[PDB]
């Protein structure tokens, strides 16, 4: 019965941060959302209505704050936030939902200002940087020639299924615009040739070039992730389908409904095994109804088999030539109760392939007529799953509490300690992950983590 132990007090955000977010009840009915940023700057971001607060992930200190304004005199909602660094600047890409449509912003943390913005032809559901620079360089050779003519590229997806690849025009240093002065896009359907001629005109007209992928419309995209090691954009749909798009060829390489059926794809996470005999790697896909009923939460492990590995001039390894993609593990966490995924995080250590690769899933279960939720952190070890002979599900009788390739931790001490504050996100600290065959079960892994709450941060150790 592995139980996390709390190692700090609750380190509160400053009052000014708490107060600013609590203006949630005017731009209401605004939900406070918060995530640790994926990059290497130790940031966590909280958003409520038009208000963004960037805080220090370990101390709770306020680092940056901004209240977005609406181009159409009505407050936008900060919907999506991603870390993004370019040149020698550190920033965030931000998707704003507006009454009309949407705006994609580039927010500079150095000066706490929006520096670029574009109007989106739809309602954004997710955003993802693809690359932070252009120019002819070994570092962009993995991308389709047409993207290489662009200068920074962000993917943006919408509630009707548009997939947009947008030029961030990071080569234009004369243009400093806020979210109110957003530029229009020039959207070309598919992927053209003669990009430079087009681009030059497009920018003389004060617009950003956008390639919209030829892809069916009508179903909302719910998840979006660029998988660096396979050069694939993963596009998860509200109907349970998952698309993989190769960003070299710009073609959709895979597209199938996950085994949970018509339930939205809520998150993905990539893993690479240490020793696999046919260039297989893995993509977890999480299906969840947490934004509606909250009755279904399931994990789906997709095995992606490729024909080759390629060392790029950059030094990076790339899986190339997708030969098959098939679901090889399924775990139902839910499906009265209410269950929601808090986080989904992959941690890999390299000594070629990582010698350690785990995915961490954190989820919360609320039973109706039960005040305090249970919170779980589960650690899946892909190599121990190999060692266990790749079972496709928990066996009869088998439990997460006693599984050779999965460790289950209770975060209930955190819940007791922090009530009634809500856990918004959980980050495991990669650098802390530390270790008779049973001994190499992941239950013996020690690690530290930080929970992001609505009012601060708090540190835990699992040992």
């Amino acid at each position: 019965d592995l139980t996390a132990q709390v190692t700090s007090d609750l380190l509160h955000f400053p009052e000014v941060t708490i107060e600013a977010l609590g203006e949630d009840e005017i731009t209401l009915e605004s939900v406070l959302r918060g995530k640790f940023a994926a990059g290497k700057n130790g940031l966590a971001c909280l958003a409520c209505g038009p208000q963004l607060e960037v805080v220090n992930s370990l101390t709770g200190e306020r680092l940056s704050a901004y209240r977005f304004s609406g181009v159409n005199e009505q407050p936008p909602v900060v919907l999506a936030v991603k870390e993004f660094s370019w040149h020698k600047r550190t920033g965030l890409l931000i998707g704003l939902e507006e009454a009309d449509g949407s705006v994609l912003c580039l927010y500079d943390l150095g000066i706490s200002r929006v520096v670029k913005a574009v109007v989106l032809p739809g309602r954004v559901t997710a955003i993802e940087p693809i690359i932070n620079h252009g120019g002819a360089s070994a570092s962009t050779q993995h991308l389709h020639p047409s993207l290489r003519w662009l200068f920074g590229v962000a993917a943006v997806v919408t509630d009707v299924g548009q997939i947009l690849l947008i030029d961030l025009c990071l080569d234009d240093l004369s243009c400093s615009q806020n979210e109110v002065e957003a530029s229009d896009l020039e959207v070309i359907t598919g992927i053209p040739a003669e990009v430079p001629h087009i681009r030059e005109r497009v920018m003389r007209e004060g617009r950003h070039l956008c390639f919209q992928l030829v892809s069916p419309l009508g179903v909302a995209i719910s998840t979006l992730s660029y998988i660096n090691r396979t050069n694939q954009l993963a596009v998860g749909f509200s109907d349970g389908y998952l698309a993989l798009w190769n960003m070299k060829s710009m073609k959709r390489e895979y597209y199938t409904q996950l085994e949970g059926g018509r339930v939205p794809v809520h998150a993905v996470a990539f893993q690479e095994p240490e020793n696999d005999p046919r260039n297989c790697c893995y993509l977890w896909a999480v299906q969840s109804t947490q934004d509606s009923e909250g009755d279904v939460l399931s994990l789906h492990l997709l095995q992606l088999a490729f024909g080759d590995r390629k060392c790029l001039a950059s030094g990076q390894i790339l899986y190339e030539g997708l030969e098959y993609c098939e679901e090889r593990y399924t775990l139902d966490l839910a499906g009265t109760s209410n269950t929601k995924l808090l986080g989904c995080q992959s941690i890999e250590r390299f000594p070629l392939s990582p010698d350690t690769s785990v995915s961490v899933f954190t989820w919360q279960v609320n039973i109706y007529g039960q005040g305090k939720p249970s919170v779980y952190l589960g650690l899946f070890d892909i190599n121990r799953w190999y060692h266990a002979q790749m079972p496709d599900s928990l066996r009869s009788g088998e439990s997460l509490h006693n599984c050779s390739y999965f460790a289950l931790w209770s975060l209930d001490s955190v819940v007791s300690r922090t009530s009634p504050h809500h856990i918004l996100d959980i980050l495991v600290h990669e650098r802390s992950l530390n270790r008779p065959e049973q001994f190499f079960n992941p239950s013996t892994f020690n690690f530290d983590a930080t929970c992001l709450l609505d009012s601060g941060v708090i540190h835990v150790t699992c040992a």
């Binding site: 070994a138 962009t140 050779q141 790029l312 001039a313 950059s314």
Partner: protein, 143 residues
């Protein structure tokens, strides 16, 4: 620099990577060696091509770093093609070497160059009938 992949037998193109060379491009390949990546200032690396050009007795060493398994993102890394000792001597940046006597300069050059070269040079001198007049023939040392 074309580079594809071999597999089964099939060769399959990936990309043509040009060179970065100017002054008309008058360098000749001496040797190239494709190999496992180095420890360069860019962690984004998949493969490394070491390249050795020549133009007369002047040489040029470059490393092409390919970032990913697509051969479309890469970066050219140059190097210094003269040693510090040589650059310092050419550009008169040498503050340490003792000045003064003509024989002082003799010791200086002897010690700097090594006997193989110093004697080959003294061989070339006498063949061309250039002979040291006296202890203090500065016109000789110059040569």
């Amino acid at each position: 620099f074309q580079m594809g992949t071999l597999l089964v037998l099939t060769y399959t193109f990936q990309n043509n990577i040009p060179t970065n060379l100017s002054a008309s491009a008058i360098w000749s390949i001496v040797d190239l060696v494709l190999t496992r990546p180095l420890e360069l200032n860019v962690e984004a690396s998949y493969l490394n091509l070491i390249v050795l050009w020549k133009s007369g007795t002047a040489s040029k060493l470059q490393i092409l770093n390919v970032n990913d398994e697509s051969f479309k993102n890469y970066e050219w890394i140059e190097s210094v093609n003269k040693s510090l000792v040589d650059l310092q001597s050419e550009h008169d940046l040498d503050i340490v070497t003792k000045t003064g006597d003509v024989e002082r300069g003799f010791c200086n050059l002897k010690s700097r160059y090594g006997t193989q070269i110093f004697e080959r040079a003294q061989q070339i001198l006498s063949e061309n009938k250039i002979i040291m007049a006296h202890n203090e023939d500065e016109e000789y040392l110059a040569n």
